[PDB]
PDB file of all heavy atoms in Angstrom:
ATOM      1  N   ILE A 396      -5.910  -6.532 -50.577  1.00  0.00           N
ATOM      2  CA  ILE A 396      -6.459  -5.450 -51.443  1.00  0.00           C
ATOM      3  C   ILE A 396      -7.809  -5.921 -51.972  1.00  0.00           C
ATOM      4  O   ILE A 396      -8.056  -7.139 -52.084  1.00  0.00           O
ATOM      5  CB  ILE A 396      -5.508  -5.011 -52.551  1.00  0.00           C
ATOM      6  CG1 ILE A 396      -5.133  -6.215 -53.462  1.00  0.00           C
ATOM      7  CG2 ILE A 396      -4.221  -4.409 -51.960  1.00  0.00           C
ATOM      8  CD1 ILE A 396      -5.795  -6.247 -54.830  1.00  0.00           C
ATOM      9  N   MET A 397      -8.639  -4.970 -52.364  1.00  0.00           N
ATOM     10  CA  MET A 397      -9.882  -5.292 -52.984  1.00  0.00           C
ATOM     11  C   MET A 397      -9.998  -4.546 -54.303  1.00  0.00           C
ATOM     12  O   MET A 397      -9.332  -3.493 -54.512  1.00  0.00           O
ATOM     13  CB  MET A 397     -11.094  -4.975 -52.088  1.00  0.00           C
ATOM     14  CG  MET A 397     -11.235  -3.487 -51.809  1.00  0.00           C
ATOM     15  SD  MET A 397     -12.833  -3.178 -50.996  1.00  0.00           S
ATOM     16  CE  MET A 397     -12.558  -1.593 -50.218  1.00  0.00           C
ATOM     17  N   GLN A 398     -10.842  -5.095 -55.168  1.00  0.00           N
ATOM     18  CA  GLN A 398     -11.051  -4.583 -56.549  1.00  0.00           C
ATOM     19  C   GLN A 398     -12.516  -4.789 -56.875  1.00  0.00           C
ATOM     20  O   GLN A 398     -13.045  -5.850 -56.683  1.00  0.00           O
ATOM     21  CB  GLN A 398     -10.181  -5.309 -57.559  1.00  0.00           C
ATOM     22  CG  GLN A 398      -8.655  -5.152 -57.473  1.00  0.00           C
ATOM     23  CD  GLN A 398      -7.975  -6.102 -58.412  1.00  0.00           C
ATOM     24  OE1 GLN A 398      -8.576  -6.908 -59.079  1.00  0.00           O
ATOM     25  NE2 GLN A 398      -6.645  -5.966 -58.514  1.00  0.00           N
ATOM     26  N   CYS A 399     -13.145  -3.771 -57.489  1.00  0.00           N
ATOM     27  CA  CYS A 399     -14.410  -4.027 -58.140  1.00  0.00           C
ATOM     28  C   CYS A 399     -14.144  -4.633 -59.525  1.00  0.00           C
ATOM     29  O   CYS A 399     -12.989  -4.615 -60.007  1.00  0.00           O
ATOM     30  CB  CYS A 399     -15.280  -2.808 -58.179  1.00  0.00           C
ATOM     31  SG  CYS A 399     -14.908  -1.554 -59.511  1.00  0.00           S
ATOM     32  N   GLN A 400     -15.184  -5.132 -60.155  1.00  0.00           N
ATOM     33  CA  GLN A 400     -14.992  -5.653 -61.520  1.00  0.00           C
ATOM     34  C   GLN A 400     -14.430  -4.581 -62.466  1.00  0.00           C
ATOM     35  O   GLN A 400     -14.884  -3.430 -62.395  1.00  0.00           O
ATOM     36  CB  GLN A 400     -16.325  -6.172 -62.081  1.00  0.00           C
ATOM     37  CG  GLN A 400     -16.180  -6.997 -63.379  1.00  0.00           C
ATOM     38  CD  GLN A 400     -17.456  -7.153 -64.135  1.00  0.00           C
ATOM     39  OE1 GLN A 400     -18.107  -6.178 -64.537  1.00  0.00           O
ATOM     40  NE2 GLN A 400     -17.798  -8.403 -64.451  1.00  0.00           N
ATOM     41  N   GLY A 401     -13.545  -4.971 -63.313  1.00  0.00           N
ATOM     42  CA  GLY A 401     -12.861  -4.034 -64.176  1.00  0.00           C
ATOM     43  C   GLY A 401     -11.654  -3.411 -63.585  1.00  0.00           C
ATOM     44  O   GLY A 401     -10.720  -2.964 -64.320  1.00  0.00           O
ATOM     45  N   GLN A 402     -11.526  -3.355 -62.284  1.00  0.00           N
ATOM     46  CA  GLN A 402     -10.265  -2.957 -61.673  1.00  0.00           C
ATOM     47  C   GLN A 402      -9.256  -4.130 -61.705  1.00  0.00           C
ATOM     48  O   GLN A 402      -9.633  -5.304 -61.925  1.00  0.00           O
ATOM     49  CB  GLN A 402     -10.437  -2.497 -60.234  1.00  0.00           C
ATOM     50  CG  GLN A 402     -11.320  -1.202 -60.175  1.00  0.00           C
ATOM     51  CD  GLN A 402     -11.362  -0.609 -58.819  1.00  0.00           C
ATOM     52  OE1 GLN A 402     -11.540  -1.270 -57.818  1.00  0.00           O
ATOM     53  NE2 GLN A 402     -11.224   0.752 -58.801  1.00  0.00           N
ATOM     54  N   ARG A 403      -7.990  -3.793 -61.528  1.00  0.00           N
ATOM     55  CA  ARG A 403      -6.866  -4.721 -61.751  1.00  0.00           C
ATOM     56  C   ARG A 403      -5.608  -3.955 -61.335  1.00  0.00           C
ATOM     57  O   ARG A 403      -5.636  -2.770 -61.159  1.00  0.00           O
ATOM     58  CB  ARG A 403      -6.778  -5.204 -63.183  1.00  0.00           C
ATOM     59  CG  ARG A 403      -6.303  -4.175 -64.200  1.00  0.00           C
ATOM     60  CD  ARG A 403      -7.351  -3.114 -64.496  1.00  0.00           C
ATOM     61  NE  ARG A 403      -6.953  -2.197 -65.530  1.00  0.00           N
ATOM     62  CZ  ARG A 403      -7.727  -1.291 -66.088  1.00  0.00           C
ATOM     63  NH1 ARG A 403      -9.041  -1.258 -65.776  1.00  0.00           N
ATOM     64  NH2 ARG A 403      -7.287  -0.503 -67.073  1.00  0.00           N
ATOM     65  N   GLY A 404      -4.522  -4.689 -61.129  1.00  0.00           N
ATOM     66  CA  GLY A 404      -3.258  -4.070 -60.750  1.00  0.00           C
ATOM     67  C   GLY A 404      -2.169  -5.081 -60.625  1.00  0.00           C
ATOM     68  O   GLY A 404      -2.334  -6.265 -60.956  1.00  0.00           O
ATOM     69  N   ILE A 405      -1.049  -4.616 -60.158  1.00  0.00           N
ATOM     70  CA  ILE A 405       0.197  -5.439 -60.041  1.00  0.00           C
ATOM     71  C   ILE A 405       0.575  -5.535 -58.520  1.00  0.00           C
ATOM     72  O   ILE A 405       0.607  -4.528 -57.856  1.00  0.00           O
ATOM     73  CB  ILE A 405       1.339  -4.803 -60.877  1.00  0.00           C
ATOM     74  CG1 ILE A 405       0.934  -4.768 -62.385  1.00  0.00           C
ATOM     75  CG2 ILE A 405       2.603  -5.644 -60.694  1.00  0.00           C
ATOM     76  CD1 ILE A 405       1.939  -4.084 -63.311  1.00  0.00           C
ATOM     77  N   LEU A 406       0.851  -6.728 -58.146  1.00  0.00           N
ATOM     78  CA  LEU A 406       1.369  -7.055 -56.824  1.00  0.00           C
ATOM     79  C   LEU A 406       2.749  -7.517 -56.900  1.00  0.00           C
ATOM     80  O   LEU A 406       3.130  -8.415 -57.734  1.00  0.00           O
ATOM     81  CB  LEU A 406       0.502  -8.159 -56.108  1.00  0.00           C
ATOM     82  CG  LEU A 406      -0.974  -7.898 -55.774  1.00  0.00           C
ATOM     83  CD1 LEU A 406      -1.863  -7.780 -57.015  1.00  0.00           C
ATOM     84  CD2 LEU A 406      -1.521  -8.990 -54.855  1.00  0.00           C
ATOM     85  N   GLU A 407       3.692  -6.977 -56.058  1.00  0.00           N
ATOM     86  CA  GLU A 407       5.065  -7.381 -56.038  1.00  0.00           C
ATOM     87  C   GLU A 407       5.452  -7.757 -54.596  1.00  0.00           C
ATOM     88  O   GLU A 407       5.137  -6.996 -53.688  1.00  0.00           O
ATOM     89  CB  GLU A 407       5.982  -6.297 -56.566  1.00  0.00           C
ATOM     90  CG  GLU A 407       5.734  -5.955 -58.022  1.00  0.00           C
ATOM     91  CD  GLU A 407       6.716  -4.976 -58.596  1.00  0.00           C
ATOM     92  OE1 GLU A 407       7.436  -4.274 -57.748  1.00  0.00           O
ATOM     93  OE2 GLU A 407       6.836  -4.837 -59.845  1.00  0.00           O
ATOM     94  N   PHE A 408       6.136  -8.898 -54.443  1.00  0.00           N
ATOM     95  CA  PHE A 408       6.549  -9.339 -53.147  1.00  0.00           C
ATOM     96  C   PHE A 408       7.666 -10.330 -53.328  1.00  0.00           C
ATOM     97  O   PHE A 408       8.047 -10.705 -54.406  1.00  0.00           O
ATOM     98  CB  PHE A 408       5.337  -9.906 -52.349  1.00  0.00           C
ATOM     99  CG  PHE A 408       4.640 -11.051 -53.100  1.00  0.00           C
ATOM    100  CD1 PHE A 408       5.012 -12.382 -52.919  1.00  0.00           C
ATOM    101  CD2 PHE A 408       3.578 -10.749 -53.976  1.00  0.00           C
ATOM    102  CE1 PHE A 408       4.303 -13.376 -53.579  1.00  0.00           C
ATOM    103  CE2 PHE A 408       2.895 -11.746 -54.653  1.00  0.00           C
ATOM    104  CZ  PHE A 408       3.240 -13.049 -54.452  1.00  0.00           C
ATOM    105  N   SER A 409       8.227 -10.712 -52.181  1.00  0.00           N
ATOM    106  CA  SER A 409       9.343 -11.616 -52.124  1.00  0.00           C
ATOM    107  C   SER A 409       9.261 -12.546 -50.916  1.00  0.00           C
ATOM    108  O   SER A 409       8.957 -12.090 -49.813  1.00  0.00           O
ATOM    109  CB  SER A 409      10.702 -10.846 -52.072  1.00  0.00           C
ATOM    110  OG  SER A 409      11.789 -11.795 -51.980  1.00  0.00           O
ATOM    111  N   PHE A 410       9.505 -13.828 -51.161  1.00  0.00           N
ATOM    112  CA  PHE A 410       9.619 -14.786 -50.024  1.00  0.00           C
ATOM    113  C   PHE A 410      11.059 -15.079 -49.683  1.00  0.00           C
ATOM    114  O   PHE A 410      11.346 -16.152 -49.154  1.00  0.00           O
ATOM    115  CB  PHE A 410       8.822 -16.039 -50.332  1.00  0.00           C
ATOM    116  CG  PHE A 410       7.360 -15.919 -50.125  1.00  0.00           C
ATOM    117  CD1 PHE A 410       6.518 -15.717 -51.209  1.00  0.00           C
ATOM    118  CD2 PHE A 410       6.820 -15.940 -48.852  1.00  0.00           C
ATOM    119  CE1 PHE A 410       5.128 -15.619 -51.019  1.00  0.00           C
ATOM    120  CE2 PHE A 410       5.448 -15.815 -48.653  1.00  0.00           C
ATOM    121  CZ  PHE A 410       4.599 -15.621 -49.744  1.00  0.00           C
ATOM    122  N   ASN A 411      11.960 -14.154 -50.041  1.00  0.00           N
ATOM    123  CA  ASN A 411      13.413 -14.297 -49.691  1.00  0.00           C
ATOM    124  C   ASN A 411      13.597 -14.398 -48.158  1.00  0.00           C
ATOM    125  O   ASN A 411      13.034 -13.578 -47.399  1.00  0.00           O
ATOM    126  CB  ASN A 411      14.187 -13.107 -50.211  1.00  0.00           C
ATOM    127  CG  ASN A 411      15.703 -13.171 -49.939  1.00  0.00           C
ATOM    128  OD1 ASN A 411      16.401 -13.951 -50.626  1.00  0.00           O
ATOM    129  ND2 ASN A 411      16.141 -12.443 -48.895  1.00  0.00           N
ATOM    130  N   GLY A 412      14.300 -15.390 -47.726  1.00  0.00           N
ATOM    131  CA  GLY A 412      14.535 -15.631 -46.350  1.00  0.00           C
ATOM    132  C   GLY A 412      13.450 -16.383 -45.607  1.00  0.00           C
ATOM    133  O   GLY A 412      13.639 -16.704 -44.409  1.00  0.00           O
ATOM    134  N   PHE A 413      12.348 -16.722 -46.278  1.00  0.00           N
ATOM    135  CA  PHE A 413      11.253 -17.368 -45.636  1.00  0.00           C
ATOM    136  C   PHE A 413      11.523 -18.899 -45.532  1.00  0.00           C
ATOM    137  O   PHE A 413      12.222 -19.479 -46.364  1.00  0.00           O
ATOM    138  CB  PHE A 413       9.947 -17.233 -46.399  1.00  0.00           C
ATOM    139  CG  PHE A 413       9.151 -15.984 -46.048  1.00  0.00           C
ATOM    140  CD1 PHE A 413       9.582 -14.680 -46.432  1.00  0.00           C
ATOM    141  CD2 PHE A 413       7.977 -16.116 -45.347  1.00  0.00           C
ATOM    142  CE1 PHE A 413       8.837 -13.563 -46.121  1.00  0.00           C
ATOM    143  CE2 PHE A 413       7.195 -14.956 -45.024  1.00  0.00           C
ATOM    144  CZ  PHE A 413       7.632 -13.665 -45.425  1.00  0.00           C
ATOM    145  N   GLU A 414      10.998 -19.528 -44.506  1.00  0.00           N
ATOM    146  CA  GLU A 414      11.007 -20.949 -44.380  1.00  0.00           C
ATOM    147  C   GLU A 414      10.309 -21.593 -45.605  1.00  0.00           C
ATOM    148  O   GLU A 414       9.187 -21.110 -45.921  1.00  0.00           O
ATOM    149  CB  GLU A 414      10.431 -21.407 -43.044  1.00  0.00           C
ATOM    150  CG  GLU A 414       9.882 -22.824 -42.954  1.00  0.00           C
ATOM    151  CD  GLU A 414       8.913 -22.983 -41.755  1.00  0.00           C
ATOM    152  OE1 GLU A 414       9.382 -22.920 -40.575  1.00  0.00           O
ATOM    153  OE2 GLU A 414       7.699 -23.188 -41.957  1.00  0.00           O
ATOM    154  N   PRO A 415      10.803 -22.631 -46.224  1.00  0.00           N
ATOM    155  CA  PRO A 415      10.110 -23.239 -47.352  1.00  0.00           C
ATOM    156  C   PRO A 415       8.829 -23.922 -46.834  1.00  0.00           C
ATOM    157  O   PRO A 415       8.777 -24.421 -45.691  1.00  0.00           O
ATOM    158  CB  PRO A 415      11.104 -24.290 -47.837  1.00  0.00           C
ATOM    159  CG  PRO A 415      12.450 -23.772 -47.403  1.00  0.00           C
ATOM    160  CD  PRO A 415      12.178 -23.200 -46.037  1.00  0.00           C
ATOM    161  N   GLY A 416       7.813 -23.936 -47.687  1.00  0.00           N
ATOM    162  CA  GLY A 416       6.494 -24.430 -47.300  1.00  0.00           C
ATOM    163  C   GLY A 416       5.394 -23.799 -48.179  1.00  0.00           C
ATOM    164  O   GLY A 416       5.650 -23.151 -49.152  1.00  0.00           O
ATOM    165  N   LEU A 417       4.169 -24.020 -47.691  1.00  0.00           N
ATOM    166  CA  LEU A 417       2.961 -23.579 -48.418  1.00  0.00           C
ATOM    167  C   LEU A 417       2.462 -22.248 -47.856  1.00  0.00           C
ATOM    168  O   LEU A 417       2.266 -22.161 -46.645  1.00  0.00           O
ATOM    169  CB  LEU A 417       1.829 -24.638 -48.312  1.00  0.00           C
ATOM    170  CG  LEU A 417       2.155 -26.006 -48.954  1.00  0.00           C
ATOM    171  CD1 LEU A 417       0.947 -26.933 -48.740  1.00  0.00           C
ATOM    172  CD2 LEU A 417       2.503 -25.876 -50.395  1.00  0.00           C
ATOM    173  N   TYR A 418       2.300 -21.249 -48.706  1.00  0.00           N
ATOM    174  CA  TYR A 418       1.846 -19.948 -48.293  1.00  0.00           C
ATOM    175  C   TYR A 418       0.525 -19.617 -49.062  1.00  0.00           C
ATOM    176  O   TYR A 418       0.528 -19.575 -50.283  1.00  0.00           O
ATOM    177  CB  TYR A 418       2.890 -18.890 -48.577  1.00  0.00           C
ATOM    178  CG  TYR A 418       4.085 -19.062 -47.652  1.00  0.00           C
ATOM    179  CD1 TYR A 418       5.108 -19.942 -47.985  1.00  0.00           C
ATOM    180  CD2 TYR A 418       4.158 -18.367 -46.433  1.00  0.00           C
ATOM    181  CE1 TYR A 418       6.199 -20.112 -47.103  1.00  0.00           C
ATOM    182  CE2 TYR A 418       5.266 -18.515 -45.606  1.00  0.00           C
ATOM    183  CZ  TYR A 418       6.270 -19.406 -45.923  1.00  0.00           C
ATOM    184  OH  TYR A 418       7.311 -19.611 -45.073  1.00  0.00           O
ATOM    185  N   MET A 419      -0.564 -19.491 -48.322  1.00  0.00           N
ATOM    186  CA  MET A 419      -1.882 -19.411 -48.930  1.00  0.00           C
ATOM    187  C   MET A 419      -2.186 -18.008 -49.486  1.00  0.00           C
ATOM    188  O   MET A 419      -1.660 -17.041 -49.013  1.00  0.00           O
ATOM    189  CB  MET A 419      -2.945 -19.795 -47.892  1.00  0.00           C
ATOM    190  CG  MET A 419      -4.289 -20.145 -48.489  1.00  0.00           C
ATOM    191  SD  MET A 419      -5.553 -20.615 -47.215  1.00  0.00           S
ATOM    192  CE  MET A 419      -4.866 -22.176 -46.591  1.00  0.00           C
ATOM    193  N   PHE A 420      -3.004 -17.975 -50.508  1.00  0.00           N
ATOM    194  CA  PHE A 420      -3.572 -16.734 -51.019  1.00  0.00           C
ATOM    195  C   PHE A 420      -5.037 -17.011 -51.493  1.00  0.00           C
ATOM    196  O   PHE A 420      -5.274 -18.001 -52.090  1.00  0.00           O
ATOM    197  CB  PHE A 420      -2.681 -16.151 -52.182  1.00  0.00           C
ATOM    198  CG  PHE A 420      -2.579 -17.028 -53.386  1.00  0.00           C
ATOM    199  CD1 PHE A 420      -3.414 -16.759 -54.508  1.00  0.00           C
ATOM    200  CD2 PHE A 420      -1.745 -18.121 -53.456  1.00  0.00           C
ATOM    201  CE1 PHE A 420      -3.344 -17.578 -55.639  1.00  0.00           C
ATOM    202  CE2 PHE A 420      -1.698 -18.920 -54.553  1.00  0.00           C
ATOM    203  CZ  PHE A 420      -2.477 -18.689 -55.652  1.00  0.00           C
ATOM    204  N   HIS A 421      -5.890 -16.071 -51.118  1.00  0.00           N
ATOM    205  CA  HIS A 421      -7.337 -16.306 -51.367  1.00  0.00           C
ATOM    206  C   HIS A 421      -8.092 -14.965 -51.163  1.00  0.00           C
ATOM    207  O   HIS A 421      -7.568 -14.042 -50.634  1.00  0.00           O
ATOM    208  CB  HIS A 421      -7.857 -17.364 -50.407  1.00  0.00           C
ATOM    209  CG  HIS A 421      -7.762 -16.980 -48.966  1.00  0.00           C
ATOM    210  ND1 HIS A 421      -8.704 -16.343 -48.272  1.00  0.00           N
ATOM    211  CD2 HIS A 421      -6.739 -17.190 -48.072  1.00  0.00           C
ATOM    212  CE1 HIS A 421      -8.319 -16.121 -47.026  1.00  0.00           C
ATOM    213  NE2 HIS A 421      -7.130 -16.604 -46.876  1.00  0.00           N
ATOM    214  N   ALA A 422      -9.351 -15.017 -51.639  1.00  0.00           N
ATOM    215  CA  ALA A 422     -10.250 -13.918 -51.416  1.00  0.00           C
ATOM    216  C   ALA A 422     -10.483 -13.759 -49.905  1.00  0.00           C
ATOM    217  O   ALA A 422     -10.601 -14.737 -49.193  1.00  0.00           O
ATOM    218  CB  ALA A 422     -11.569 -14.059 -52.080  1.00  0.00           C
ATOM    219  N   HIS A 423     -10.573 -12.497 -49.442  1.00  0.00           N
ATOM    220  CA  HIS A 423     -10.993 -12.297 -48.031  1.00  0.00           C
ATOM    221  C   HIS A 423     -12.477 -12.110 -47.905  1.00  0.00           C
ATOM    222  O   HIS A 423     -12.946 -11.811 -46.819  1.00  0.00           O
ATOM    223  CB  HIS A 423     -10.220 -11.121 -47.430  1.00  0.00           C
ATOM    224  CG  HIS A 423      -9.813 -11.395 -46.035  1.00  0.00           C
ATOM    225  ND1 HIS A 423     -10.738 -11.557 -45.011  1.00  0.00           N
ATOM    226  CD2 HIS A 423      -8.585 -11.502 -45.454  1.00  0.00           C
ATOM    227  CE1 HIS A 423     -10.082 -11.771 -43.858  1.00  0.00           C
ATOM    228  NE2 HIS A 423      -8.798 -11.769 -44.152  1.00  0.00           N
ATOM    229  N   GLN A 424     -13.265 -12.325 -48.972  1.00  0.00           N
ATOM    230  CA  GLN A 424     -14.654 -12.644 -48.880  1.00  0.00           C
ATOM    231  C   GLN A 424     -14.698 -14.138 -48.660  1.00  0.00           C
ATOM    232  O   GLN A 424     -14.425 -14.972 -49.556  1.00  0.00           O
ATOM    233  CB  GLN A 424     -15.389 -12.290 -50.167  1.00  0.00           C
ATOM    234  CG  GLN A 424     -15.519 -10.771 -50.391  1.00  0.00           C
ATOM    235  CD  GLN A 424     -14.105 -10.119 -50.627  1.00  0.00           C
ATOM    236  OE1 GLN A 424     -13.698  -9.309 -49.806  1.00  0.00           O
ATOM    237  NE2 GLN A 424     -13.384 -10.581 -51.633  1.00  0.00           N
ATOM    238  N   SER A 425     -15.029 -14.561 -47.422  1.00  0.00           N
ATOM    239  CA  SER A 425     -14.774 -15.899 -46.956  1.00  0.00           C
ATOM    240  C   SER A 425     -15.406 -16.972 -47.874  1.00  0.00           C
ATOM    241  O   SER A 425     -14.760 -17.958 -48.258  1.00  0.00           O
ATOM    242  CB  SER A 425     -15.228 -16.104 -45.529  1.00  0.00           C
ATOM    243  OG  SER A 425     -14.506 -15.223 -44.674  1.00  0.00           O
ATOM    244  N   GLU A 426     -16.664 -16.818 -48.200  1.00  0.00           N
ATOM    245  CA  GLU A 426     -17.389 -17.788 -49.004  1.00  0.00           C
ATOM    246  C   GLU A 426     -16.762 -17.946 -50.397  1.00  0.00           C
ATOM    247  O   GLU A 426     -16.806 -19.039 -50.951  1.00  0.00           O
ATOM    248  CB  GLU A 426     -18.868 -17.418 -49.101  1.00  0.00           C
ATOM    249  CG  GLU A 426     -19.704 -18.679 -49.274  1.00  0.00           C
ATOM    250  CD  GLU A 426     -21.211 -18.448 -49.377  1.00  0.00           C
ATOM    251  OE1 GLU A 426     -21.645 -17.412 -48.813  1.00  0.00           O
ATOM    252  OE2 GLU A 426     -21.901 -19.235 -50.013  1.00  0.00           O
ATOM    253  N   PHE A 427     -16.185 -16.849 -51.011  1.00  0.00           N
ATOM    254  CA  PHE A 427     -15.548 -17.053 -52.258  1.00  0.00           C
ATOM    255  C   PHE A 427     -14.377 -18.042 -52.120  1.00  0.00           C
ATOM    256  O   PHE A 427     -14.160 -18.886 -52.973  1.00  0.00           O
ATOM    257  CB  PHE A 427     -14.952 -15.699 -52.795  1.00  0.00           C
ATOM    258  CG  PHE A 427     -15.982 -14.658 -53.141  1.00  0.00           C
ATOM    259  CD1 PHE A 427     -17.259 -14.764 -52.822  1.00  0.00           C
ATOM    260  CD2 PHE A 427     -15.498 -13.473 -53.740  1.00  0.00           C
ATOM    261  CE1 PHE A 427     -18.172 -13.716 -53.110  1.00  0.00           C
ATOM    262  CE2 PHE A 427     -16.395 -12.426 -54.071  1.00  0.00           C
ATOM    263  CZ  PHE A 427     -17.687 -12.573 -53.773  1.00  0.00           C
ATOM    264  N   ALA A 428     -13.641 -17.906 -51.057  1.00  0.00           N
ATOM    265  CA  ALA A 428     -12.481 -18.784 -50.772  1.00  0.00           C
ATOM    266  C   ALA A 428     -12.989 -20.254 -50.658  1.00  0.00           C
ATOM    267  O   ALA A 428     -12.447 -21.109 -51.367  1.00  0.00           O
ATOM    268  CB  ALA A 428     -11.713 -18.323 -49.534  1.00  0.00           C
ATOM    269  N   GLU A 429     -13.984 -20.399 -49.836  1.00  0.00           N
ATOM    270  CA  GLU A 429     -14.595 -21.766 -49.629  1.00  0.00           C
ATOM    271  C   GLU A 429     -15.064 -22.366 -50.963  1.00  0.00           C
ATOM    272  O   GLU A 429     -14.934 -23.555 -51.156  1.00  0.00           O
ATOM    273  CB  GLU A 429     -15.766 -21.591 -48.643  1.00  0.00           C
ATOM    274  CG  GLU A 429     -16.770 -22.741 -48.572  1.00  0.00           C
ATOM    275  CD  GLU A 429     -18.031 -22.335 -47.793  1.00  0.00           C
ATOM    276  OE1 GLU A 429     -17.904 -21.435 -46.899  1.00  0.00           O
ATOM    277  OE2 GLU A 429     -19.113 -22.930 -47.999  1.00  0.00           O
ATOM    278  N   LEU A 430     -15.531 -21.554 -51.901  1.00  0.00           N
ATOM    279  CA  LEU A 430     -16.109 -22.020 -53.162  1.00  0.00           C
ATOM    280  C   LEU A 430     -15.181 -22.072 -54.307  1.00  0.00           C
ATOM    281  O   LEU A 430     -15.514 -22.221 -55.457  1.00  0.00           O
ATOM    282  CB  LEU A 430     -17.335 -21.197 -53.531  1.00  0.00           C
ATOM    283  CG  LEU A 430     -18.577 -21.285 -52.614  1.00  0.00           C
ATOM    284  CD1 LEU A 430     -19.660 -20.202 -52.929  1.00  0.00           C
ATOM    285  CD2 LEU A 430     -19.172 -22.634 -52.626  1.00  0.00           C
ATOM    286  N   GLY A 431     -13.818 -21.938 -54.006  1.00  0.00           N
ATOM    287  CA  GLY A 431     -12.825 -22.160 -55.055  1.00  0.00           C
ATOM    288  C   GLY A 431     -11.680 -21.131 -55.196  1.00  0.00           C
ATOM    289  O   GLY A 431     -10.616 -21.471 -55.774  1.00  0.00           O
ATOM    290  N   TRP A 432     -11.919 -19.896 -54.794  1.00  0.00           N
ATOM    291  CA  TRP A 432     -10.900 -18.847 -54.972  1.00  0.00           C
ATOM    292  C   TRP A 432      -9.986 -18.987 -53.728  1.00  0.00           C
ATOM    293  O   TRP A 432     -10.042 -18.181 -52.761  1.00  0.00           O
ATOM    294  CB  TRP A 432     -11.514 -17.526 -55.096  1.00  0.00           C
ATOM    295  CG  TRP A 432     -10.660 -16.215 -55.101  1.00  0.00           C
ATOM    296  CD1 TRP A 432     -11.139 -14.927 -55.212  1.00  0.00           C
ATOM    297  CD2 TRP A 432      -9.180 -16.086 -55.050  1.00  0.00           C
ATOM    298  NE1 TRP A 432     -10.100 -14.034 -55.178  1.00  0.00           N
ATOM    299  CE2 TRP A 432      -8.912 -14.723 -55.091  1.00  0.00           C
ATOM    300  CE3 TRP A 432      -8.142 -16.995 -55.027  1.00  0.00           C
ATOM    301  CZ2 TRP A 432      -7.588 -14.210 -55.044  1.00  0.00           C
ATOM    302  CZ3 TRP A 432      -6.818 -16.523 -54.936  1.00  0.00           C
ATOM    303  CH2 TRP A 432      -6.580 -15.133 -54.924  1.00  0.00           C
TER     304      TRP A 432
END
């Protein structure tokens, strides 16, 4: 999902049944991710 400044919302999800491990989350603006998000 994307948001302009001032937008916001609620995300709900579940990792029930998933293999244990690391699951990444980051901006899909690539350089934002590279620079810390």
Side-chain angles (χ1 to χ4, degrees):
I396 58 107
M397 64 169 160
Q398 295 171 353
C399 80
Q400 191 199 57
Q402 296 189 317
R403 72 287 184 170
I405 299 174
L406 294 69
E407 298 186 343
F408 53 94
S409 177
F410 281 101
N411 182 79
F413 272 74
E414 156 199 293
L417 299 178
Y418 291 84
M419 197 179 293
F420 63 100
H421 61 91
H423 220 296
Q424 293 62 244
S425 297
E426 209 179 333
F427 297 8
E429 164 192 334
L430 294 171
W432 173 184

